[PDB]
């Protein structure tokens, strides 16, 4: 048994889109104060949404810790004879960002960022040794402050510093790390069945697996190789580039 | 205020590496009775390690929202007039494995996986859709068994299924999408200052910035038509290859009397 009180995460702003929590199988006799009133326990909500037709709403919470928690203990939950599905409601407003200069921090990708409207959250991702990637993310309060952003960036050249190195804007591809493939939502088709006939092993030497296996990581390594190239040939292209442009600078 | 117990999420194993925790600015008359005391609200440790000349331990917590409860509420809290600097250890055996089949499951990547030592939790990522990206990750409990993993599926071939499929194991690249680049940890040299002199705007058409950032857009699509040349070159190498494996499969066959 344990008592807490706001589970906000450093520099986590309050009531963001992350906390949208999709709501479904709800009575058909639903009122938004009764759809309020099952959220009761996880604070204040805001942006209440509840299309009572439909038995689904949309509702959202202080932090993201109280969204995984009002989701872990509510999913699930008996509502008038039927099963509550509690889920996350997928940022529209994320974009992930590319092309940054070493020197853009956080404060400066939200301070340009923020131009296209508000702007929940701005991170610069860093790798092991705290070094940065050169990617970034940025989540608005609202899509169309984000489509402004991904429509103004892809046809304009939208630069954060001095040196124009245009930075390169893409909606956030959404990927889960928690949940996964579980074998509870995996079909059990003739192929899956096929698949897993032989258990994971390794390829002895000297058999067709093994020959063939050989060949598959021959081809990896091909791969691997022609992808080097390829990031080699773009540093060449950027190095031979920026020799004659600020040279040129001197033209006009 | 509000009230929860076992804020373990759905299939999250318990005592986990990223329910670890690295302490450090602490008294260097730390015993370790007194460390244990300091995390006592968090429920029992598994994991308890303390450096007492350097000031620092390790804690592990049940679950991974405890291991945030326990960062949120302590890191910077005055020990002996010391800020007590609390964050998550970096998982020292995580992998992340490519050319996975899409039949393959989180628990069938566990299983497979375990062959190398104990696994803490392995993921099949999947897309917006559900749909397998190819991609998986696997944590192990200790450094070993993941460096073992490693080895050995880069010198060998490691099928998970039927198909001779060879599964690429990789360290996981670590990524901080919470704290990232803050101001305070980037150094205000020259080149920062000349790089933020001009704000943040948009090329004027004509302008040299333009046609500069301009070049660079073009650069980008040089680097989108390359990468697509490359898929292009791997797509013929395999069926190249499929053509010559099926020949390969009758010759291997008719060996065997």
Redesign the interface.
Same mark, same amino acid.
């Given at each position: /048994?344990? =008592?807490?009180?706001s589970?906000?995460?450093?520099?986590e702003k309050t009531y963001t889109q992350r906390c949208r929590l999709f709501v479904g199988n709800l009575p058909t006799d639903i009122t938004e104060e009764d759809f309020k009133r099952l959220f009761e326990? *996880?604070?204040e909500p805001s942006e209440v949404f509840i299309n009572r037709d439909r038995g689904f709403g949309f509702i959202r919470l202080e932090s993201r /810790?109280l969204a995984?928690?009002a989701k $872990?203990?509510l999913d699930g939950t008996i509502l008038k004879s039927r099963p509550l599905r509690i889920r996350f409601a997928?940022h529209g407003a994320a974009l992930t960002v590319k092309?940054l200069?070493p020197? &853009?921090?956080?404060?400066?990708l939200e #301070?340009?960022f923020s #131009?296209f409207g508000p702007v929940e959250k701005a &991170?610069? @991702? @860093? =790798?092991?040794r705290?070094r $940065?990637?050169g990617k970034?993310?940025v989540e608005f309060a609202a899509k169309p402050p984000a489509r402004k952003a991904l429509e103004?960036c892809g046809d304009?050249?939208?630069?954060?510093? /001095? /040196?124009? +190195? !245009?930075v390169?804007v893409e909606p956030m591809?959404?990927?889960? =790390?928690? =949940?996964?493939? !579980? %074998?509870k939502?995996?079909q059990k088709?003739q #192929?899956?069945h096929?698949?897993?006939?032989?258990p !994971?092993?390794?390829?002895q030497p000297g058999?067709? %697996?093994?020959? *063939?296996?050989?060949?598959?990581?021959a081809?990896?390594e091909?791969?691997k190789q #022609?992808?080097e190239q &390829?990031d080699r040939?773009?540093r060449e292209?950027?190095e031979k580039?920026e020799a004659e442009?600020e040279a $040129? +600078?001197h033209?006009?």
């Open positions: /048994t344990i =008592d807490i009180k589970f906000l995460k450093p520099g326990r *996880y604070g /810790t995984e928690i $872990a203990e997928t092309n200069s020197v &853009v921090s956080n404060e400066l #301070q340009a #131009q &991170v610069v @991702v @860093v =790798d092991d705290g $940065a990637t970034g993310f103004r304009g050249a939208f630069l954060l510093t /001095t /040196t124009p +190195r !245009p390169i591809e959404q990927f889960d =790390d928690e =949940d996964g493939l !579980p %074998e939502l995996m088709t #192929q899956y096929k698949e897993r006939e032989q !994971p092993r390794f390829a058999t067709f %697996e093994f020959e *063939y296996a050989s060949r598959w990581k081809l990896d091909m791969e #022609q992808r &390829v040939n773009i292209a950027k580039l442009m $040129a +600078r033209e006009h």
